[PDB]
Write a structure and sequence with these properties.
It is classed as splicing. Keywords: spliceosome, pre-catalytic spliceosome, spliceosomal B complex, splicing. This protein has 2 helices and 2 strands, in the order ββαα. By secondary structure, it is of the alpha+beta class. Strand 1 (9-12) and strand 2 (17-20) form a beta hairpin. The chain binds one RNA strand through helix 1.
RNA sequence: GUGCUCGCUUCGGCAGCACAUAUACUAAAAUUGGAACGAUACAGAGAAGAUUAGCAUGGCCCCUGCGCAAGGAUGACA
């Protein structure tokens, strides 16, 4: 009925997802098992690609 | 198994004869695995432009100053 305003949204490139820009959602996404798995896979991929390079 | 052979043979039996002709995912049981968008937990504006303030540039019209080029009209006795 008046000026709509959207909450900020943060892209997670480790998890290839979207979450909310606020303390609780970002903090909960940090402690997710999927987030840790994606971070570990990203680190492993970085090291493997550097070795192949 | 039933019934029959003028069979051996006795009613205790035997040999042969006619009919019977090929079912089943076959299964009662064996085990260890991988598992929600269902709940709770979090977030939740779950549909808007992703803006407005100056100055300078660019266009048009005058005015003023300097330079370049080409010129017009005029003025001056002893």
């Amino acid at each position: 009925a008046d000026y709509w305003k959207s909450q900020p949204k943060k892209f997670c490139d480790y998890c290839k997802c979207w979450i909310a820009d606020n303390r609780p959602s970002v903090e909960f996404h940090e402690r997710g098992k999927n987030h840790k798995e994606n971070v570990a896979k990203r680190i492993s991929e970085i090291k493997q690609k550097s070795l192949d390079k």
